[PDB]
């Protein structure tokens, strides 16, 4: 392997105004939206599960 | 063998700025406590700033637990309201 | 530590410095009123004459106000201090807060 | 007529000195009062009750009143 | 039992409870004194126009603020611990009674000679007899001989409970798998009430304790009659 | 110049005290609240035991 | 202890310890544990009430098998499986 | 703009996604324990690993690639890791407290003895002793890794770090085998309770520490570490030594003295 | 950058005191109301 | 006079009895006549009139010690409004008794209490101080 | 502390509205539940 | 023999509030003595003191549970 | 922009604001639960039901007030707002981890509310003792949801503790030593260390309860050789450090409030105040068993824990007398914040003295699990902690918002609250001494009067809480913007204006060493 740190330092110091969690490129946006969708969708599902568990069956 | 980079080769950003400035004996990012002068009007404490004002904390006597805080403005030297030692702002950068 | 006489002589000397500036006058009075005492008339006299050298009539009246305030409920302290200061008040033309109506709420 | 020179130093410390001693005096007054009106009162009440107390006579009065499950 | 508008402890029925009353009187006076002193000093600091706002030296006065409370704590600890160990003192009991906690009632066992055991349930409010006490009466009381040192053993067969009788200075937790011991000595006959003192479910408030103290002769005949 | 307290202090104090005493006295005595006071010096003991 | 090599603890010294002491010790323990391997005869089943606790069924399987159940050595509340 | 040496962090969604992942994992465990479903639990675990990956990814971006880790920022992270390990020590302390409470005072239900009647403990001189030599050896090899890194030796750093990881995996496989082979279970009273809960939480920490070392291994492969700046390795080394010391206490207390 | 100053360093608007009153009423009211309706929920089950 | 928000980093005026000489003058900008007054102040103060002396004081200071230390009638508003809301609380208690609380148990009926009281006296509840100690068993009445 | 005069003064009548609305937001929902307690207990 | 038993006396081995071991020990002691007396053709009456103490101290449900488990073969103590 | 600022925050001020909003909302929930308690006890009989629903309310009352109201307001709220400002730091050491500490709490609160909605709730008490909390007496998900709620709150405070300790130690000006930091900063660090050391023990205890309920472990089950008393040791080893975690930030704010409104530049006996807070924290780890005097422990152990508990009165007394010495000679400003602090000093002292009464294991036999204990801790919590929170809130509200409160309304609020809390809890001393047990939905007839008065007091407190909401509305409605603040020379947090800019101390303060 060769030292490619200088290329990453240039990429993540690029003056594009992007936050660090999105500065890697389009793949960061996809991984973020996958994470947030599962979190928000799972949270809504947990609220449904609470409603079901709150009454006898 | 080698193969491990050094800070001289690979440090970047603010870390490199601190490293290179310390190698010149400079402290632009306020890592060290400044040493006081005698604090007279003729020999005031010189407070660097990038703006025209900066908050000064004055420990009037050694081992005082109370710190005296005040804004030091550009212009004529100002005195600590508790002990009267003089401070003068030196803007640059 | 230091006697009452040494303390008063320190403050008399402090206010008697001929070229005392406005900052040192305020610093002196603001520090002095923190102590558990009403300042001796000789101290106030030196402070009032410092106001004269600084061409500051208003601070001289304020100093008389804070003498009365430091006395708290002891009503007899302020008339005594004014009595002892009357020659200085007449010499310098310093009107008391009462003569100026500044004791009225 | 001139006015006499009043005490001008340490008036706050003198007020504190006077009333801290005063509070100490009142504390002793309360301790004596409390020992007499509460502590000793409880001591004598229990001592007077049991000096000539008759537990069998007490029981018989309770039994005749019908309070017991085991003693009619 | 407690009476309406009661301010302090129920009247002592045991010598140990009598010691607790006297230690509480001794301690309550100190609590009254310190709180009054603090309240007064507060008003003292707030009722003068005189001022002193410069730096105050603290070392000398903090000797007073430390030695005096330390001495006071010692005058509390000494009688407190003396009562603590006299509670624990070796005594020679003449009878051992076990109580088992249940949801939601107490069962008692007298197994020194015969196998006497029974349950003790709260008298419901609708079934109280005129003059009986709401939430306090039981169907089967704990009959005990008066003026005799009794060993009580406390346990439980389900959740935690606590067997308490304030008149006698008694409170012993009822823990399953554990046999806790306390001593009981009543100076007088009568009825002495207590209530479960550990949260134990839906009827935690409704499983009281009633001790019936009678002469030995009546206790012996009562024990025989309950075989 | 007179502030709110100079203009209305006396009325607020008087009306507040009068309203507070009246409604608490009413609540304490007129709606059937059970205070359960001590029977000492107030209740005549009555026979309770039956056959 | 017994070794002396002090004055400079560095990469070479700690590799010396890794290959000269640490890994040989693992080899010896592996060897030792390898002679003492092999199954021991499982003991007779006694339905002790302080063992094989079941106060709520497990959330897997049939609710009666522990998570890493071994049929050879782990009996059920009713005894060993077959 | 700033003339201090500290790091102002970009606004980040990972705190929220991490907190929501904890909600999903805890409500998932409740769903699993009581309502016979693992769905919420799997979503929580997945979001938890996505949060941890992107969070620590950003920390590497902020430090290796952007240079925000000044000596003052490094010193703060040093305090943070030490304090975190301290809180982990107190967590295990509770389980050692539980163990000694039960074993020093064996109740009648156990037969009044320790080990309890019907419990046949593992031999502490067989695999438990082997596991002790494995973790002790990994403490030596990870120290060789550290000195190799400080002296600028890339090849031997990766050599020692790989050996340390292999030993960590070796311990996990040996423990997994010991779990299956054990004649006692987590349901075999307070002996099985203290044994598996304490060693199980330790085994989890071994897996966490091994993962941390693997992260440092691949970061070393990509030349992230300098000979002077490499706190990610140091934090992993501190955590690995913590894992080792906990085992030594487990071995002495539960495997040896408790046998 | 973000807005600064009074009424701008908060996640709720204070532009209109009556819209704010409704929001504070809903915010604090829902917290106070929640235990009463949970008690109602439990009583309505058994 | 006018103090601004962005002024927070500058020395400001305060009226404190324990800080009699503030960092700045109450009035900063002087008119033509006020400028002339300050020039006259450099001469003997005996030549100043009472109105001019008051004017010099009001330029340096905002309130006098008497003005800044004056009492107010705020306690009347505070105490009176506190009793109103405490009085309003009783309205909530009245509503609760009327609409929420049902009947209290039958053991509080007057006849039950009278019989319960005797039974407590029959078992000698609190006979040393608390209860039965206040009953006269010889005279069959409450001790006077 | 010194402060500016209110940029949007709240008159006594406006304070009466806010006070009443605030108290009613606390009292009405809880009052409704407590009023219907007997319906909840026996149904 | 030296009998007049009222209740179990103080035992210095078990001097604290927790009396679980006192009941457990005397239950063991009686049945260990009973087994010794039964096996070698003796009289169980020599075990009577242990019987009186454990019956005084032990909860009925403890004895009954321990009795069931001795008969079932699951009693964890050594007898 | 809104989501980036308030959901993705890395700013200590905004995060502190979120904590304050969260704690205020929780305070509404805790208040409603407290009224449901005293409504049940307001007259003899049963109002809601049997002890199950009652103790579910009691259990949630404690949890909400402690973990969701006091701790987020004092530590997460005032701590995040004031600590960086008081040391001239640009932010917390871990600003992004700081955001997760907050956002763990709404799910923690959701889990608590879920436990009371499913099955019959967790009617166990906030101590959650087994076997009542076990899977037999409390089958179902309620207790497990309660445990997980405590898990999330535990993680939140442990990470917050790591953040505060690191920030306070590492991010001061290079010339400022630890003995040049304000007392509130001291109180937060000491609180953070108690959190760091005690919560992991709690997390271990409740994890063992979780496995006992769901994995057939028997840590606390005698059938498997366990001991229910072991849980009590594990809980209370955290439990007492927790009550000192609840009061220590209050101690720090009181020091600042008393100093400020006495016109003083410094508190009396600074080093004595530091010594006392550190002594109180240390002693708080070796006294836990005074919550267990009736469980059947040896007399020698009961003699030690009685003695060790009482020592704590000495360092605490130093703080009380130093607060009085700070008042001595001051230019007293009778602000509403000062009134709260003066009420704190007296009422906390009363509650502290009744704690010393309970420290005596002999007397505690009769007082344990009675309302005398309830009287003790409500004086130090519902008057101590609460008044410190209210005093801090009215003192620093102009700094946080830039608007001023109505001082007359705030004084009226204090007057109503003072009457309400004392009418509520002072008669509970009588109920405790006379023998009324804790956690009862109903009581014998003799306890009627004091229960009636106590419940009437709680309604007065409700009126104060409702007035508080109006007072906050009136401040935001009127928009009286702050101009000048006194004593900025010894109160650094005010020196950047009201409110301070989003970024403060971008250029750090100048402090030389001389
Ligand atoms: C803010 C919370 C807080 C604080 C500060 C305290 C402070 C103290 N507490 Fe309290 N306590 C609780 C919250 C708190 N407590 C809670 C919540 C419970 C019950 C939990 C439950 O069961 O649910 C409890 C229960 C509790 C018990 C158990 C009673 C029982 O359950 O049977 C005991 C007994 O030792 C106790 C003691 C003390 C002591 C000695 C102090 C001391 O720190 C107080 C020291 C202060 C002073 C002493 C006053 C100031 C000192 C002076 C003015 C000097 C002069 C004084 C003397 C010379 C004595 N507490
Ligand atoms: C901090 C903790 C705290 C607080 C504040 C309170 C507040 C109150 N408590 Fe509570 N209580 C406990 C902690 C607390 N309690 C604990 C630990 C127990 C034991 C639980 C158990 O046994 O398991 C208990 C038990 C308890 C009982 C016993 C139940 C029983 O044993 O059967 C009772 C009954 O009278 C009671 C009453 C009250 C009352 C009337 C208040 C009232 O004073 C409420 C008054 C309102 C407030 C104090 C306002 C709240 C604060 C805010 C809204 C802040 C606002 C926000 C900003 C300013 C930003 N409490
Ligand atoms: C090296 C291998 C390690 C094991 C890997 C298995 C799963 C990993 C999970 C990690 C959980 C860590 C702690 C779990 C506690 C107990 C687990 C004990 C360790 C273990 O895995 O031991 C097994 C447990 O089984 C079982 O059900 C296990 C059931 C798992 C249920 C999960 C419960 C998780 C609870 C977490 C609570 C929160 C943790 C604390 C957070 C505090 C925050 C402040 C024993 O198996 P057995 O079938 O009895 O056979 C034995 C003889 N053949
Ligand atoms: C595997 C199956 C389930 C397991 C669950 C959890 C999974 C495992 C996670 C293991 C931990 C991985 C952590 C990766 C961290 C990478 C980021 C990193 O290491 O970041 C470093 C900073 O350290 C830092 O933040 C260090 C901070 C990291 C602390 C993490 C410590 C472990 C925490 C894990 C959670 C424990 C849970 C406890 C259970 C009770 C970067 O600084 P440097 O390297 O000095 O500077 C870069 C140089 O190039 C400059 O020249
Ligand atoms: C401790 C928490 C606070 C407790 C104290 C509450 C203070 C007073 C709140 C009043 O609440 C309202 O009371 C009405 C009665 O006065 C109820 O109307 C009820 O009664 C009316 C007349 O009887 C009917 O017209 C309505 O339909 C019926 O809902 C109404 O629902 C309820 O919201
Ligand atoms: Cu049994 Cu409470
Ligand atoms: O808890 O004290
Ligand atoms: Cu405690
Ligand atoms: Mg208890
Ligand atoms: Na009730
Ligand atoms: Zn200075």
| CA-based R_g, chain J, Å | 37
Which among H82, H81, H49, H62 is positioned nearest to H12, based on CA atoms?
A: H62
**Separation of alpha carbons E177 and L23, rounded Å:** 12
| CA dihedral angle for residue H106, residue H108, residue H112, residue H113, rounded to 10 degrees | -60
**Which residue's entry shows tokens 């305070």?**
M27
CA M442 to each of CA E134, J107, M286: distance values in angstroms, whole numbers, following the listed order? 10, 14, 36
Q: What is the whole-number distance in angstroms between the Cα of residue E77 and the centre of ligand 8?
A: 18
Cα maximum dimension of chain H: 72
Chain M and chain H touch, per 3+ beta carbon pairs within 8 A: yes
**Separation of alpha carbons G27 and H137, rounded Å:** 11
Burial of E56 (C-beta count, 10 Å sphere; 0-12/13-18/19+): middle
CATH superfamily of E95-225: Cupredoxins -  blue copper proteins (2.60.40.420)
Q: Where are the domains of chain K?
A: 1-43
Instruction: Annotate C65-78 with DSSP letters as a single string.
Output: HHHHHHTTT-TTHH
Mutate to test the interface with F, among M42, M44, M45, M449 (most CBs of F within 10 A): M449
Chain M residues closer than 8 Å to I29 by CB:
28
Strand, coil or helix: B58: strand
**Ligand with smallest separation from the Cα of B68:** 11
Contact at CB, K29 and I17, closer than 8 angstroms: no
**Separation of alpha carbons H135 and H113, rounded Å:** 31
Side-chain half-sphere of L11: how many Cα atoms within 13 Å?
A: 18
Q: Is the CB of G13 under 6 A from ligand 3?
A: no
What 8-state DSSP symbol labels residue A42? H
Chain J and chain A touch, per 3+ beta carbon pairs within 8 A: no
CA M230 to each of CA H88, H97, M63, M150: distance values in angstroms, whole numbers, following the listed order? 20, 9, 22, 19
Which among M166, M319, M200, M161 is positioned nearest to M250, based on CA atoms?
A: M319
Write out the binding residues of E: 161, 196, 198, 200, 204, 207
**Separation of alpha carbons H76 and H235, rounded Å:** 12
Residues in chain F: 51
- Tokens coding H207: 């897996």
Which approach determined this entry? X-ray
How close J123 gets to chain M, by Cα (Å)? 16
**Separation of alpha carbons E157 and E119, rounded Å:** 13
CA M45 to each of CA M114, M286, M451, M457: distance values in angstroms, whole numbers, following the listed order? 29, 41, 12, 19
**Which residue's entry shows tokens 């509520």?**
M424
**Separation of alpha carbons C54 and C21, rounded Å:** 7
How close D7 gets to chain C, by Cα (Å)? 8
Contact at CB, D69 and E21, closer than 8 angstroms: no
**Separation of alpha carbons H154 and B5, rounded Å:** 9
Nearest beta carbon to residue K22 from set M470, M481, M485: M470
With an 8 Å Cβ cutoff, the interface of chain M facing chain K consists of 32, 35, 39, 47-49, 398, 404, 462, 465-467, 469-470, 473-474, 477-486
Strand, coil or helix: D10: coil
Contact at CB, A13 and B5, closer than 8 angstroms: no
Domain M2-514 has what CATH class? Answer: mainly alpha
Burial of J104 (C-beta count, 10 Å sphere; 0-12/13-18/19+): middle
Chain J residues closer than 8 Å to D42 by CB:
129
Please report which helix (H) or strand (E) contains residue J141, including its range.
strand J141-142
Chain J residues closer than 8 Å to E190 by CB:
123-124
Q: Which residues contact E166 (CB under 8 A, 6 or more apart)?
A: E2, E9, E10, E194, M366, M434, M435
Host domain of residue D66: 1-72
Is residue K34 less than 8 Å (CB to CB) from chain J? yes
Mutate to test the interface with M, among H11, H17, H59, H186 (most CBs of M within 10 A): H11
- Tokens coding K31: 């009052």
| CA-based R_g, chain B, Å | 18
Host domain of residue J17: 1-144
Number of domains in chain C: 1
CA D15 to each of CA C73, C79, D12, H100, H236: distance values in angstroms, whole numbers, following the listed order? 12, 22, 5, 61, 64
| CA dihedral angle for residue G58, residue G61, residue G67, residue G72, rounded to 10 degrees | 120
> Number of residue pairs across I and K with CB atoms under 8 Å?
40
**Ligand with smallest separation from the Cα of M355:** 1
Q: Is the CB of M205 under 6 A from ligand 3?
A: no
Backbone angles phi, psi at B53, to 5 degrees: -150, 150
Q: Is the CB of M59 under 6 A from ligand 2?
A: yes
Contact at CB, F48 and J115, closer than 8 angstroms: yes
Which among M262, M272, M419 is positioned nearest to M328, based on CA atoms?
A: M262
Backbone angles phi, psi at M187, to 5 degrees: -65, -30
L62-71 long-range Cβ contacts below 8 angstroms, 24+ apart: L62/L23, L62/L27, L63/L27, L66/L27, L69/G49, L70/L31
Does residue E209 contact residue E123 with C-beta atoms inside 8 Å?
no
Closest residue in chain L to residue M229, using alpha carbons only = L18
Q: Is the CB of M436 under 6 A from ligand 1?
A: no
Is residue E182 less than 8 Å (CB to CB) from chain L? yes
**Separation of alpha carbons E5 and M291, rounded Å:** 28
CA H144 to each of CA C52, H82, H241, M109: distance values in angstroms, whole numbers, following the listed order? 80, 21, 13, 47
Confirm whether residue M298 is marked as ligand binding.
no
Strand, coil or helix: E208: strand
Q: What is the whole-number distance in angstroms between the Cα of residue F26 and the centre of ligand 2?
A: 29
Which among M179, M174, M85, M90 is positioned nearest to M511, based on CA atoms?
A: M174
Chain L and chain H touch, per 3+ beta carbon pairs within 8 A: yes
Q: Is the CB of M293 under 6 A from ligand 2?
A: no
Please report which helix (H) or strand (E) contains residue K16, including its range.
helix K12-35
Contact at CB, K25 and I39, closer than 8 angstroms: no
How close M210 gets to chain G, by Cα (Å)? 12
Chain M residues closer than 8 Å to G56 by CB:
135, 139, 213-214, 216
**Separation of alpha carbons H155 and G11, rounded Å:** 12
Please list every protein residue whose CB sits less than 6 Å from any atom of ligand 7. Answer: M 240, 243
Side-chain half-sphere of M144: how many Cα atoms within 13 Å?
A: 24
> Number of residue pairs across D and M with CB atoms under 8 Å?
3
Beta strand E142-145 with E150-156 is: unpaired
Q: B: neighbours with 3+ CB pairs under 8 Å?
A: A, C, H, J, M
Using alpha carbons only, what angle is made at residue M47 by residues M44 and M52, rounded to the nearest 5 degrees? 105
Q: How much of chain G is helix, strand and coil, in % rounded to 5?
A: 30, 0, 65
Q: In what order do the strands lie in the sheet with B86-91?
A: B45-49, B86-91, B78-79
Q: What is the whole-number distance in angstroms between the Cα of residue H57 and the centre of ligand 4?
A: 10
Q: Which residues contact M191 (CB under 8 A, 6 or more apart)?
A: M74, M75, M161, M164, M244, M245, M248, M249, M281
Residue of the CA atom closest to atom 16 of ligand 1: M377
- Tokens coding M155: 């993680």
**Separation of alpha carbons H145 and G17, rounded Å:** 12
Q: What is the whole-number distance in angstroms between the Cα of residue E179 and the centre of ligand 1?
A: 29
Q: Is the dihedral of CA E175, E210, M452, M54 positive or negative?
A: positive
| CA-based R_g, chain L, Å | 13
What beta strand segments (E) does E49-128 contain?
95-102, 105-110, 116-120
**Separation of alpha carbons M87 and M98, rounded Å:** 18
**Ligand with smallest separation from the Cα of E161:** 6
**Separation of alpha carbons D63 and E71, rounded Å:** 50
**Ligand with smallest separation from the Cα of M458:** 2
Q: Is the dihedral of CA L36, L42, L45, L49 positive or negative?
A: negative
**The CATH number of the domain covering residues in E15-88:** 1.10.287.90
Number of domains in chain J: 1
CA I8 to each of CA G27, I4, M1, M498: distance values in angstroms, whole numbers, following the listed order? 68, 5, 13, 12
Residues in chain L: 79
Strand, coil or helix: M46: coil
Which among J127, J103, J128, J106 is positioned nearest to J115, based on CA atoms?
A: J106
What are the catalytic residues of M? 61, 91, 126, 156-157, 240, 242, 244, 255, 290-291, 316, 319, 438
Task: Please name the residue ranges forming H helices in F1-51.
Answer: 4-29
> In testing the pocket of ligand 2, which one of M17, M26, M37 has its CB within 8 Å of the most ligand atoms?
M37
Residue of the CA atom closest to atom 2 of ligand 7: M240
């Amino acid at each position: 392997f060769e030292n490619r740190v200088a290329e990453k330092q240039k990429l993540f110091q690029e003056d594009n105004g992007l936050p660090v969690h999105l500065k890697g490129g389009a793949t960061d946006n996809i991984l973020y939206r996958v994470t947030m969708t599962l979190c928000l969708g799972g949270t809504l599902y947990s609220l449904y599960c609470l409603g079901w568990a709150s009454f006898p069956h | 063998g080698g193969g491990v980079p050094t800070d001289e080769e690979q440090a970047t950003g603010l870390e490199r700025e601190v490293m290179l400035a310390a190698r010149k004996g400079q402290d632009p990012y306020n890592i060290l406590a400044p040493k006081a002068t005698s604090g007279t009007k003729e020999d005031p404490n010189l407070v660097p700033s990038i703006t025209n004002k900066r908050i000064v904390g004055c420990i009037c006597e050694e081992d005082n637990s109370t710190v005296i805080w005040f804004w030091l403005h550009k212009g004529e030297a100002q005195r600590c309201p508790s002990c009267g030692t003089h401070y003068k702002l030196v803007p640059h950068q | 530590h230091e006697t009452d006489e040494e303390f008063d002589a320190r403050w008399v000397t402090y206010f008697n410095k001929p070229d005392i500036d406005a900052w040192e006058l305020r610093k002196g009075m603001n520090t002095l009123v923190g102590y558990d005492l009403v300042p001796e008339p000789k101290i106030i006299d030196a402070a009032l004459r410092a106001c004269r050298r600084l061409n500051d009539f208003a601070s001289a009246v304020r100093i008389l106000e804070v003498v009365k305030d430091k006395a708290g409920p002891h009503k007899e302290i302020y008339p005594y201090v004014i009595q002892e200061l009357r020659p200085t008040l007449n010499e310098l033309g310093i009107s008391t807060p009462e003569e100026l109506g500044l004791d009225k709420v | 007529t001139a006015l006499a020179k009043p005490q001008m130093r340490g008036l706050l410390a003198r007020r504190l000195r006077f009333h801290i001693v005063g509070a100490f005096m009142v504390s002793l007054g309360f301790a004596t009062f409390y020992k007499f009106a509460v502590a000793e009162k409880r001591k004598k009440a229990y001592a007077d009750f049991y000096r000539n107390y008759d537990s069998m006579k007490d029981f018989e009065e309770m039994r005749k009143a019908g309070i017991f499950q085991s003693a009619k | 039992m407690a009476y309406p508008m009661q301010l302090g402890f129920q009247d002592a029925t045991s010598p140990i409870m009598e010691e607790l009353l006297h230690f509480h009187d001794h301690t309550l006076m100190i609590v009254f004194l310190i709180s009054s002193l603090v309240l007064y000093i507060i008003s003292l600091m707030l009722t003068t126009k005189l001022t002193h706002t410069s730096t105050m030296d603290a070392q000398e006065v903090e000797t007073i603020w430390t030695i005096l409370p330390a001495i006071i704590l010692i005058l509390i600890a000494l009688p407190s611990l003396r009562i603590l160990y006299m509670m624990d003192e070796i005594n020679n009991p003449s009878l051992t009674v076990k109580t088992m906690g249940h949801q939601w009632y107490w069962s008692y066992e007298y197994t020194d000679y015969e196998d006497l055991s029974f349950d003790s349930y709260m008298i419901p409010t609708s079934e109280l007899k005129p003059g009986e006490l709401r939430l306090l009466e039981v169907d089967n009381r704990v009959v005990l001989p008066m003026e005799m040192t009794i060993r009580m053993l406390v346990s439980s067969e389900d959740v935690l409970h606590s067997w308490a009788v304030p008149s006698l200075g008694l409170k012993t937790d009822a823990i399953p798998g554990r046999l806790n011991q306390t001593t009981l000595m009543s100076s007088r006959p009568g009825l002495y009430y207590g209530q479960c003192s550990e949260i134990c479910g839906s009827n935690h408030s409704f499983m009281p304790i009633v001790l019936e103290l009678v002469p030995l002769k009546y206790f012996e005949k009562w024990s025989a009659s309950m075989l | 110049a007179p502030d709110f307290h100079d203009k209305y202090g006396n009325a607020v104090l008087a009306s507040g005290a009068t309203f507070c005493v009246a409604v608490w006295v009413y609540m304490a005595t007129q709606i059937g609240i059970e205070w359960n006071p001590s029977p000492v010096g107030r209740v005549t003991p009555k026979e309770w035991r039956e056959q | 202890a017994a070794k002396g090599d002090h004055g400079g603890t560095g990469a070479r010294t700690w590799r010396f310890l890794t290959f000269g002491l640490a890994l040989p010790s693992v080899a010896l323990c592996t060897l030792n544990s390898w002679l003492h391997s092999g199954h021991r005869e499982r003991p007779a089943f006694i339905p002790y009430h302080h063992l094989r606790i079941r106060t709520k069924p497990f959330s897997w399987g049939d609710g009666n098998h522990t998570f890493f159940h071994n049929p050879r050595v782990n009996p059920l509340p009713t005894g060993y499986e077959k | 703009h700033q003339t201090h040496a500290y790091h102002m962090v970009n606004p980040s969604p990972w705190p929220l996604t991490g907190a929501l992942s904890a909600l999903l994992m805890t409500s998932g465990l409740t769903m699993w324990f009581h309502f016979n479903s693992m769905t919420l639990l799997m979503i929580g675990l997945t979001t938890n690993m996505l949060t941890m990956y992107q969070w620590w990814r950003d920390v590497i971006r902020e430090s290796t690639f952007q240079g925000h880790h000044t000596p003052a920022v490094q010193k703060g992270l040093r305090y943070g890791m030490i304090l975190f390990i301290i809180s982990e020590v107190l967590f295990f302390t509770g389980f050692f407290w539980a163990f000694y409470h039960s074993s020093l005072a064996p109740t009648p239900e156990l037969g009044g003895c320790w080990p309890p009647t019907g419990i046949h403990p593992l031999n502490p001189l067989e695999v438990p002793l082997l596991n002790t030599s494995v973790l002790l050896a990994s403490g030596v090899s990870i120290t060789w890794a550290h000195h190799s890194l400080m002296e600028g030796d890339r090849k031997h750093m990766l050599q020692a770090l790989f050996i340390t990881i292999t030993l960590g995996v070796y311990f996990t496989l040996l423990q997994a085998s010991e779990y299956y082979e054990a004649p006692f279970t987590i349901s075999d009273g307070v002996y099985g309770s203290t044994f598996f809960v304490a060693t199980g939480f330790h085994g989890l920490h071994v897996i966490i520490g091994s993962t941390f070392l693997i992260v440092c291994f691949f970061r070393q492969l990509k030349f992230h570490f300098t000979s002077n700046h490499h706190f990610g390795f140091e934090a992993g080394a501190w955590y690995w030594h913590f894992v080792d010391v906990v085992w030594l206490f487990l071995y002495v207390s539960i495997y040896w003295w408790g046998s | 950058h973000y807005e600064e100053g009074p009424g701008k360093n908060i996640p709720f608007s204070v532009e209109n005191k009556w819209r704010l009153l409704a929001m504070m009423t809903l915010f604090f009211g829902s917290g106070f109301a929640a235990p009463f309706f949970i008690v109602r929920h439990q009583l309505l089950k058994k | 006079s006018v103090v601004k928000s962005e002024d927070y980093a500058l020395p400001s005026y305060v009226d404190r009895r324990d800080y009699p000489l503030p960092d700045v003058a109450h009035v900063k900008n002087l008119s033509a006549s006020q400028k002339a007054l300050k020039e006259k102040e450099k001469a003997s103060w005996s030549s100043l009139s009472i109105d001019e002396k008051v004017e010099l004081y009001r330029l340096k200071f905002k309130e006098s010690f008497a003005e800044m230390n004056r009492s107010t009638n705020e306690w009347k508003t505070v105490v009176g409004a506190a009793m109103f809301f405490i009085g309003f609380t009783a309205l909530l208690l009245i509503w609760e008794k009327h609409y929420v609380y049902g009947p209290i148990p039958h053991t509080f009926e007057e006849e039950w209490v009278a019989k319960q009281t005797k039974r407590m006296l029959d078992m000698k509840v609190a006979p040393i101080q608390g209860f039965s100690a206040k009953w006269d068993y010889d005279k069959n009445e409450w001790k006077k | 502390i010194t402060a500016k005069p209110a940029k949007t003064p709240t008159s006594p009548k406006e304070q009466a509205i806010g006070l009443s609305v605030t108290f009613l937001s606390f009292l009405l929902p809880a009052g409704w539940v407590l009023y219907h307690l007997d319906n909840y207990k026996k149904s | 023999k030296i009998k007049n038993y009222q209740t179990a006396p103080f035992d210095s081995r078990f001097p604290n509030q927790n009396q679980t071991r006192n009941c457990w020990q005397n239950y063991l002691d009686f049945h260990r003595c009973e087994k010794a007396m039964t096996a070698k053709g003796g009289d169980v009456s020599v075990c009577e003191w242990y019987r009186r103490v454990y019956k005084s101290l032990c909860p009925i449900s403890w004895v009954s549970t321990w009795d069931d488990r001795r008969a079932e073969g699951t009693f964890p103590g050594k007898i």
